[PDB]
CSV table of C-alpha atoms and ligand atoms in Angstrom, one decimal:
chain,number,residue,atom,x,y,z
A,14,UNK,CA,-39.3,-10.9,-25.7
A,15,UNK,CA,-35.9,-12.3,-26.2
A,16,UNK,CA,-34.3,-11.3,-29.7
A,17,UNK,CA,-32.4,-13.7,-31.2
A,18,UNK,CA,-29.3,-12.6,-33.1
A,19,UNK,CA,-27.5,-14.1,-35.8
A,20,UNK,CA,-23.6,-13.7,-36.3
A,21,UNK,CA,-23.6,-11.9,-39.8
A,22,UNK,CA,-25.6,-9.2,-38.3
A,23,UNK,CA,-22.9,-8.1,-35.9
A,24,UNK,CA,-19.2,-7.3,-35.8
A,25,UNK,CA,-16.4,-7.0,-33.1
A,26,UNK,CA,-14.0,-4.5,-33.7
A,27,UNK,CA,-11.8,-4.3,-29.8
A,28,UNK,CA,-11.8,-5.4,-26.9
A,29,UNK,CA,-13.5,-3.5,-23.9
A,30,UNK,CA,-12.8,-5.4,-21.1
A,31,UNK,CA,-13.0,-8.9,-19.6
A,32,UNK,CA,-13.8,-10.9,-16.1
A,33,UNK,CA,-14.6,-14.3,-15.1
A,34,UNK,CA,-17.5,-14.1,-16.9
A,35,UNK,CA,-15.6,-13.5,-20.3
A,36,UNK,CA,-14.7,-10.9,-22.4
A,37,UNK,CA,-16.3,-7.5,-23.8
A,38,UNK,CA,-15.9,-6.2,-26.8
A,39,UNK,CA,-17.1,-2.8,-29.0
A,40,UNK,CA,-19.0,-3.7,-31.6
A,41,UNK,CA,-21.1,-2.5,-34.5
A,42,UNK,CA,-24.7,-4.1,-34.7
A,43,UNK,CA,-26.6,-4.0,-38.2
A,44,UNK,CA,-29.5,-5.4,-37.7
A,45,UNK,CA,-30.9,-7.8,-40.2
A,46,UNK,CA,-32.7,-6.3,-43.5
A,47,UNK,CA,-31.3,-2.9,-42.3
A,48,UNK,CA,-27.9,-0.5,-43.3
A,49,UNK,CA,-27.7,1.6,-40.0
A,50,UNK,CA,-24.7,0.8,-37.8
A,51,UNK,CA,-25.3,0.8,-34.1
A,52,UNK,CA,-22.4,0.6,-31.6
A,53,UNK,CA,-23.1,-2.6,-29.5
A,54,UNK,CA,-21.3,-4.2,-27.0
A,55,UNK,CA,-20.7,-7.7,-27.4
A,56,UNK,CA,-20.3,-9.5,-24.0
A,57,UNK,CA,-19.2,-13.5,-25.0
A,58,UNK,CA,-19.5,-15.3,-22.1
A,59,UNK,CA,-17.3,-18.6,-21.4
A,60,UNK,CA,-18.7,-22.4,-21.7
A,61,UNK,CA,-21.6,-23.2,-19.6
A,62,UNK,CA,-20.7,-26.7,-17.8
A,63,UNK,CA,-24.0,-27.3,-16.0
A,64,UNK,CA,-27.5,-26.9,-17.3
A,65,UNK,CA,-27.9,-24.9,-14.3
A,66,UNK,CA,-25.6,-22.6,-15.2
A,67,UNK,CA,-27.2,-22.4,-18.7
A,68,UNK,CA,-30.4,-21.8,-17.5
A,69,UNK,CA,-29.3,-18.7,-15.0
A,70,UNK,CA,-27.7,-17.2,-18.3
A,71,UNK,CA,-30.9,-17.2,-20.0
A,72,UNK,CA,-32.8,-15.9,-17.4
A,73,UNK,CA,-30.5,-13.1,-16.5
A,74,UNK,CA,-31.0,-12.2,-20.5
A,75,UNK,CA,-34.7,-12.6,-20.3
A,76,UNK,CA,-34.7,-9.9,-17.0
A,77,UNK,CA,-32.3,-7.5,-18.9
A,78,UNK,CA,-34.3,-7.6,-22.0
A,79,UNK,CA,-37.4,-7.1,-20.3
A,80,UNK,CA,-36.2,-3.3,-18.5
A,81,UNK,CA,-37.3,-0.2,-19.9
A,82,UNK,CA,-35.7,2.7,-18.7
A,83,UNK,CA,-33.6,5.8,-19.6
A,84,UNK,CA,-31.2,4.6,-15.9
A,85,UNK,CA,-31.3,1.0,-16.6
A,86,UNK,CA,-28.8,-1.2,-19.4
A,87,UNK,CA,-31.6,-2.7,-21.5
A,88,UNK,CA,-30.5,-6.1,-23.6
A,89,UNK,CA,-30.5,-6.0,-27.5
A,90,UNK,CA,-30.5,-9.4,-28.4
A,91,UNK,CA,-28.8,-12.8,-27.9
A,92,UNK,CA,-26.2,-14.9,-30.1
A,93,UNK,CA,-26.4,-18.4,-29.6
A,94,UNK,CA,-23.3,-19.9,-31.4
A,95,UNK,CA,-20.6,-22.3,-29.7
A,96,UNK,CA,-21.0,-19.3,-27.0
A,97,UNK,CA,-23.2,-17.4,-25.8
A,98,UNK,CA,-22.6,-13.1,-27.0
A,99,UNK,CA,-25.4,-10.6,-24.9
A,100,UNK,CA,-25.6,-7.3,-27.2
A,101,UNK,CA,-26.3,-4.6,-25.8
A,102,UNK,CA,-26.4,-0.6,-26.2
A,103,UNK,CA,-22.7,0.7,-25.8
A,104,UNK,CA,-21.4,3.0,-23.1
A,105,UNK,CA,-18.9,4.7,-24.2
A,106,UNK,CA,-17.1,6.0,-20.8
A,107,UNK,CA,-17.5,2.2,-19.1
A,108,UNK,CA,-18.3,1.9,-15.3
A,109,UNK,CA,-18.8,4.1,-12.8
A,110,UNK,CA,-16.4,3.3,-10.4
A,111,UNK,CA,-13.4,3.4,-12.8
A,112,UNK,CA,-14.8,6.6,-14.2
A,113,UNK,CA,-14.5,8.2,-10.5
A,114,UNK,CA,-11.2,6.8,-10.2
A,115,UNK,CA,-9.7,8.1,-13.4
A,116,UNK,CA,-11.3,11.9,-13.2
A,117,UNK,CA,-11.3,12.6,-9.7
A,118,UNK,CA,-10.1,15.8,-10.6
A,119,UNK,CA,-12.2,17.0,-13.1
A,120,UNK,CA,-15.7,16.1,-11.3
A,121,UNK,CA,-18.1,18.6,-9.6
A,122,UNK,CA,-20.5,18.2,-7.2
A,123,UNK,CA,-23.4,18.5,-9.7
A,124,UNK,CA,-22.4,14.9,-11.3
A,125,UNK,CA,-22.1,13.8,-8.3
A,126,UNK,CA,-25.5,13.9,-7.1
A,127,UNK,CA,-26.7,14.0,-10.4
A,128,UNK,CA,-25.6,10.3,-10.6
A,129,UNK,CA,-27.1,9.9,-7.1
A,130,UNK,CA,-30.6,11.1,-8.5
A,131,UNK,CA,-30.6,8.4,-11.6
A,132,UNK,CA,-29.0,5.4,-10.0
A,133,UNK,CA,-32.0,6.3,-7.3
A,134,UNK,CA,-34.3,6.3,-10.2
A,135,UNK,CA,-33.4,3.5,-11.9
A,136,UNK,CA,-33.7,1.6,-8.5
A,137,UNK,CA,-36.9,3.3,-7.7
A,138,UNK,CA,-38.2,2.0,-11.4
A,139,UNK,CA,-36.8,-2.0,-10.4
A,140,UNK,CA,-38.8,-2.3,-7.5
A,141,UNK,CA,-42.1,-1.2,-9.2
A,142,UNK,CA,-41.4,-4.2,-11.8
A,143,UNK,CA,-40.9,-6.2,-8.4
A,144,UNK,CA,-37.2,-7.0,-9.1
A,145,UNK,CA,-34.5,-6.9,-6.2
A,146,UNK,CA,-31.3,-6.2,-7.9
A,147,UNK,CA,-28.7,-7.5,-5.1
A,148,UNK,CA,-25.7,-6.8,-6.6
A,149,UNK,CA,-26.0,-2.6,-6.7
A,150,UNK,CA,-22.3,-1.0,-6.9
A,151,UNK,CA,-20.7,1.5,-8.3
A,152,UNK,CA,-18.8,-1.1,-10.9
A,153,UNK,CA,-22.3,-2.1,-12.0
A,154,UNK,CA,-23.0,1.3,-13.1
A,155,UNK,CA,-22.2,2.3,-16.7
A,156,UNK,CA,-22.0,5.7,-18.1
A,157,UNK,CA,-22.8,7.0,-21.2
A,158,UNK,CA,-22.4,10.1,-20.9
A,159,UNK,CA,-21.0,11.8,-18.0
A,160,UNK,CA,-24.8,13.5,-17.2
A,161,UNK,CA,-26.2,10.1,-18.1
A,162,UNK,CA,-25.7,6.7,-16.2
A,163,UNK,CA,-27.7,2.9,-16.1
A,164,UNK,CA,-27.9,0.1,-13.7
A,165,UNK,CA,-26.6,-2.8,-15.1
A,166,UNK,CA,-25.7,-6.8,-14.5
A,167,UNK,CA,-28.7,-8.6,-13.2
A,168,UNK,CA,-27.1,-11.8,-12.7
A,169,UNK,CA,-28.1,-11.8,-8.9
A,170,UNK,CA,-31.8,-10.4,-9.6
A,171,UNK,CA,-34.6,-12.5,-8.1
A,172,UNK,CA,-38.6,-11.1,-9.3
A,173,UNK,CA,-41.1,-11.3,-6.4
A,174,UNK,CA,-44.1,-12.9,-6.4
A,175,UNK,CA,-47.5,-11.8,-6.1
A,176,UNK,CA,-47.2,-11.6,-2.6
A,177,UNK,CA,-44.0,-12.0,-1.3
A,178,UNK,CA,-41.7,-8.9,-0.4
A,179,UNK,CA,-38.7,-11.4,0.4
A,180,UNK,CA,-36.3,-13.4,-1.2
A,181,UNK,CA,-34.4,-16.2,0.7
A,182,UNK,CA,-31.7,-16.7,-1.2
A,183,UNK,CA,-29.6,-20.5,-0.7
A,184,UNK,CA,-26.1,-19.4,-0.4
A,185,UNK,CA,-23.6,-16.7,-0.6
A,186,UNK,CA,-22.6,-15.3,-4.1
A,187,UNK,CA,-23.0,-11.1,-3.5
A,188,UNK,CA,-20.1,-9.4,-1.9
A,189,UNK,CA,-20.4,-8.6,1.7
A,190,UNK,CA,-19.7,-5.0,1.7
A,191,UNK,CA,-22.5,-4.5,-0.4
A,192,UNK,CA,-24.5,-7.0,1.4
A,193,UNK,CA,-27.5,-5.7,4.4
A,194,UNK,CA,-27.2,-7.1,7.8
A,195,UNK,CA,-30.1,-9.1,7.6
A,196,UNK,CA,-29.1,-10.6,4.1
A,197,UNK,CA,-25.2,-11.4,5.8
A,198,UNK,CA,-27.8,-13.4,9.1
A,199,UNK,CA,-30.1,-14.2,7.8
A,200,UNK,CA,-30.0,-14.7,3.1
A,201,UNK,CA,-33.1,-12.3,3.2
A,202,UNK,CA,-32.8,-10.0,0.1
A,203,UNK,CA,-35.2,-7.1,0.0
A,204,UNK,CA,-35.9,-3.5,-1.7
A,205,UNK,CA,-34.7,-2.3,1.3
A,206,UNK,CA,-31.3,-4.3,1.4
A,207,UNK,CA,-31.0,-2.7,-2.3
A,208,UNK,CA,-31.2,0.6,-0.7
A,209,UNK,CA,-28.5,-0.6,1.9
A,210,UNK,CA,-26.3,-1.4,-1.1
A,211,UNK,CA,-27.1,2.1,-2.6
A,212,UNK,CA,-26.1,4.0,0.3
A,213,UNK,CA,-22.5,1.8,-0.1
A,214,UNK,CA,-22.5,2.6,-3.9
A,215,UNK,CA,-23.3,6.5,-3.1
A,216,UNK,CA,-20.1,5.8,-0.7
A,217,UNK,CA,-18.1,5.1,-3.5
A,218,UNK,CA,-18.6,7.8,-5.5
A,219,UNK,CA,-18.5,10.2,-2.6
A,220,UNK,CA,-14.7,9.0,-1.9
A,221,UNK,CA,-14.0,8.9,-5.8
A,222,UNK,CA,-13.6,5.0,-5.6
A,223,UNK,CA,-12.2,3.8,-2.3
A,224,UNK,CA,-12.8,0.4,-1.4
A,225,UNK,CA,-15.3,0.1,1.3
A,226,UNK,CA,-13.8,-1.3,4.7
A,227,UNK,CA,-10.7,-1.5,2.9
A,228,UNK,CA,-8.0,-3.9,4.5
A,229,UNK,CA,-10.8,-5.4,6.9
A,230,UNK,CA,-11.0,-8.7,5.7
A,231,UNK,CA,-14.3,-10.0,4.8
A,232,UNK,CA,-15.0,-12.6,8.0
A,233,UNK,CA,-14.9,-9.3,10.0
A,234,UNK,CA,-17.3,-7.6,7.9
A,235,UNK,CA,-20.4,-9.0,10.3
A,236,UNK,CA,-18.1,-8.6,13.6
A,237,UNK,CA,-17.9,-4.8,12.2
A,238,UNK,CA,-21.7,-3.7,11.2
A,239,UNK,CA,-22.7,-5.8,15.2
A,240,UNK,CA,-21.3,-3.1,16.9
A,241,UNK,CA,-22.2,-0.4,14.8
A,242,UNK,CA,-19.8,1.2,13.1
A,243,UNK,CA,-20.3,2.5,9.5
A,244,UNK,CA,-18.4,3.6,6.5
A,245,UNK,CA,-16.5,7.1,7.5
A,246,UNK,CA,-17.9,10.4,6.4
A,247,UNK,CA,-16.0,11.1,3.1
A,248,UNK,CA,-14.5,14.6,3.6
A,249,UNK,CA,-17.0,15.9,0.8
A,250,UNK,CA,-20.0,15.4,2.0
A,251,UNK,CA,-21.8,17.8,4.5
A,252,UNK,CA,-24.2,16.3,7.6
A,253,UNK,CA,-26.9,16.5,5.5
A,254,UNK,CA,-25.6,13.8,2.8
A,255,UNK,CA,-23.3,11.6,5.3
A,256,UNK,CA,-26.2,11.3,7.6
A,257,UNK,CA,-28.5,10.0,4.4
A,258,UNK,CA,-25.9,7.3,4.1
A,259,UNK,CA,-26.1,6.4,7.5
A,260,UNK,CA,-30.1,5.8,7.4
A,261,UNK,CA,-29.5,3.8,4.2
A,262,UNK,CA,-27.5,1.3,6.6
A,263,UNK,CA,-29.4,0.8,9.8
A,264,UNK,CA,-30.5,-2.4,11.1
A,265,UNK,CA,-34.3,-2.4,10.9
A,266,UNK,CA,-34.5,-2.3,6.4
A,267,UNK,CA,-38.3,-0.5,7.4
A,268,UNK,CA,-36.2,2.3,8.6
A,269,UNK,CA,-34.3,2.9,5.6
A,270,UNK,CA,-35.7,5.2,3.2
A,271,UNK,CA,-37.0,3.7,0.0
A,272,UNK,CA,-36.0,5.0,-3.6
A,273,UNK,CA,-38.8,7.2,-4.1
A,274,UNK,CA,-37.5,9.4,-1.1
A,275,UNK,CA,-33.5,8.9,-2.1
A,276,UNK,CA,-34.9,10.8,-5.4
A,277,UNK,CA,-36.5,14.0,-3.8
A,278,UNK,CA,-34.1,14.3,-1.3
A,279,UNK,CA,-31.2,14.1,-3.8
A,280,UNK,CA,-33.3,16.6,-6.2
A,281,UNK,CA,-33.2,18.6,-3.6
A,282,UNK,CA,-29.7,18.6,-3.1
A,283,UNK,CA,-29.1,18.4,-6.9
A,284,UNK,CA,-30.1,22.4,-7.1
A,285,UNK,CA,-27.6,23.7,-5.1
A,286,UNK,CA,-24.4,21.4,-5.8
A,287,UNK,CA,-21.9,23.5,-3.4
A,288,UNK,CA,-24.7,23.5,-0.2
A,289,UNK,CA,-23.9,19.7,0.3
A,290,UNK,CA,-20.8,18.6,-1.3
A,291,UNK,CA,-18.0,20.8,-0.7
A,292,UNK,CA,-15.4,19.7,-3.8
A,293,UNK,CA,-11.7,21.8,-3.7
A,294,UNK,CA,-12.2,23.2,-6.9
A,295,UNK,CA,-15.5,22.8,-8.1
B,1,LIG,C1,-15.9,-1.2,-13.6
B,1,LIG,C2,-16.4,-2.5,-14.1
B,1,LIG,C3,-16.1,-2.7,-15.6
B,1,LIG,O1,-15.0,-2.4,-16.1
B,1,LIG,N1,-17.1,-3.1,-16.4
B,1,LIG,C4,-17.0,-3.3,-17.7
B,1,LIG,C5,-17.7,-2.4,-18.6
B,1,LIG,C6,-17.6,-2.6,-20.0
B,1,LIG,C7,-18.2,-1.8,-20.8
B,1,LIG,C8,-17.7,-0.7,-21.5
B,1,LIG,C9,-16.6,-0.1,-21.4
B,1,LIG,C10,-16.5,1.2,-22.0
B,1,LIG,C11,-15.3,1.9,-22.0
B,1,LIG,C12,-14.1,1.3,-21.5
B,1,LIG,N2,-13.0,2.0,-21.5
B,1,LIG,C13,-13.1,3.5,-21.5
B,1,LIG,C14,-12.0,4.2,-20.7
B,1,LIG,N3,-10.7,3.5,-20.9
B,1,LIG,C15,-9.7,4.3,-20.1
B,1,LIG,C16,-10.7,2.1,-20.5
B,1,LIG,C17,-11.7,1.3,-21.3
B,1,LIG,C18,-14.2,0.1,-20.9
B,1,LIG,C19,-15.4,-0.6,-20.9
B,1,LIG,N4,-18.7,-0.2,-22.2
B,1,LIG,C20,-19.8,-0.9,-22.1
B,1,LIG,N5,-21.0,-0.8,-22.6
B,1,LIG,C21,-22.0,-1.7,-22.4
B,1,LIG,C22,-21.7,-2.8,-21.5
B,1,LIG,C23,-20.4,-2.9,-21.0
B,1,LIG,CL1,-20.2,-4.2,-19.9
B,1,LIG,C24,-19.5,-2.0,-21.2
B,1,LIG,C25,-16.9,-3.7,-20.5
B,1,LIG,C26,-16.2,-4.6,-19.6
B,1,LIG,C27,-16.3,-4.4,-18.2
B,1,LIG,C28,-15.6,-5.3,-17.4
C-alpha cells in the first residue's frame, strides 16, 4: 500500500534536521487533484550504493506505511527521483529526547508518564502486528504535541513469522545500551528485548536526557550488565517506578513485563502524577 508521490505535489520550505541517513526538511504536501496544504516532512535520503541497501529502504517504507496508530509515525508516501524523499506527517516539537533536554524545567510529572503510557502503547500495538522494533529510544520518539508522542524509524524492524517469536539477526547494527543481554550474546531480538529497550528509553526521560552508562565505553557495556548492575535510580522516580525499570532489564526476557502490563501500571501511575515522580516544582 505504498503511495507513490510525484515532485510537483510537494514542496520544501527548511531544513529540519539531518544524519547519516540525510537530511529533513518541513514541507507542505498538496496532494495531487487537491488544494489543501498539509505540513509534511520530507526526509531525502543519500545514494543507495548496493541493491541491498535499496531494497532495505523500500522495505523500511513498506513497514512504516503499513502502521496504523494514534503512537506510531505512519508513512505518507514515497518520491522516487535521483533520491529517494519518505513524506511523512510533521511533528512539530521534533524528538523526544531533545525535547527533554531543552524543557527540563518546564515539564511535570504528568507528561512524563503520560509519554510512558503511549510509547507503551504504541509498543503494545507493534507486537500485535508481529513487528520487533529493535531500535526503541528516546531519539526515535517524535512529539507532536507535548500530550501527544509516536514511535518512529523502523529501519531495524524484522516481522515474525507465523510461528516464530525470535529473530536472529546477522550482525551488529543497534546500539548496545539499548540492546537486551541476550540480543548483545546471543543476536536474539524479541518483544521482550523491545521492552528491555523501553525500560532504557523510560530511563531517558526520567533523567531529562542523560546518556545511559555515560563515559563507559561500549566493549564494557556486556562486562557491565554480567555482573548485574543497572542504570541508577534517577532522583525523580519513587521505588515504585525505578523498580519497573529494573524488571524491564532482567536476564530471563519471560520475566520482563510485556506492553500490555507497562500500560496499566503506568495508567495507574498516570492518575496521581506527584505519588511516583517527585519533580522540584511541579
Ligand atoms: C532527536 C533525533 C532527531 O533530531 N530526529 C529528527 C527529527 C526530525 C523531525 C522533526 C523536527 C521537528 C522540530 C525540530 N526542531 C524544533 C525545535 N528546535 C529547537 C530545533 C528543531 C527538529 C526536527 N519533525 C519531524 N517530523 C516528522 C519526522 C521527523 Cl524525522 C521530524 C527531523 C530530523 C531529525 C534528525
Amino acid at each position: 500500500l505504498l503511495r507513490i508521490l510525484k515532485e510537483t505535489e510537494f514542496k520544501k520550505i527548511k531544513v529540519l534536521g539531518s544524519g547519516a541517513f540525510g537530511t529533513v526538511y518541513k514541507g507542505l504536501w498538496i496532494p495531487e487533484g487537491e488544494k489543501v496544504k498539509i505540513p509534511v516532512a520530507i526526509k531525502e535520503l543519500r545514494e543507495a550504493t548496493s541493491p541491498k541497501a535499496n531494497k532495505e529502504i523500500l522495505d523500511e517504507a513498506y513497514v512504516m506505511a503499513s502502521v496504523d496508530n494514534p503512537h506510531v509515525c505512519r508513512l505518507l508516501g514515497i518520491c522516487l527521483t535521483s533520491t529517494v524523499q519518505l513524506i511523512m506527517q510533521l511533528m512539530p516539537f521534533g524528538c523526544l529526547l531533545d525535547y527533554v533536554r531543552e524543557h527540563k524545567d518546564n515539564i511535570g510529572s504528568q507528561y512524563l508518564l503520560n509519554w510512558c503510557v503511549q510509547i507503551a502503547k504504541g509498543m503494545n500495538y507493534l507486537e500485535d502486528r508481529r513487528l520487533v522494533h529493535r531500535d526503541l529510544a528516546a531519539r526515535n520518539v517524535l512529539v507532536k504535541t507535548p500530550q501527544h508522542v509516536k514511535i518512529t524509524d523502523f529501519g531495524l524492524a524484522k516481522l515474525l513469522g507465523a510461528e516464530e517469536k525470535e529473530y536472529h539477526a546477522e550482525g551488529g547494527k543497534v546500539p548496545i545500551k539499548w540492546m537486551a543481554l541476550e540480543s548483545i550474546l546471543h543476536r536474539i531480538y524479541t518483544h521482550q528485548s523491545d521492552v528491555w529497550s523501553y525500560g532504557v528509553t523510560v530511563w531517558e526521560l526520567m533523567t531529562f536526557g542523560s546518556k545511559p552508562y555515560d563515559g563507559i565505553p561500549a566493549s564494557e557495556i556486556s562486562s557491565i550488565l554480567e555482573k548485574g548492575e543497572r542504570l541508577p535510580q534517577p532522583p525523580i522516580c519513587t521505588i515504585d517506578v525505578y523498580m519497573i525499570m529494573r524488571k524491564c532489564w532482567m536476564i530471563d526476557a519471560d520475566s520482563r513485563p510485556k506492553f500490555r502490563e507497562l500500560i496499566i501500571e503506568f495508567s495507574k501511575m498516570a492518575r496521581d502524577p506527584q505519588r511516583y515522580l517527585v519533580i522540584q516544582g511541579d
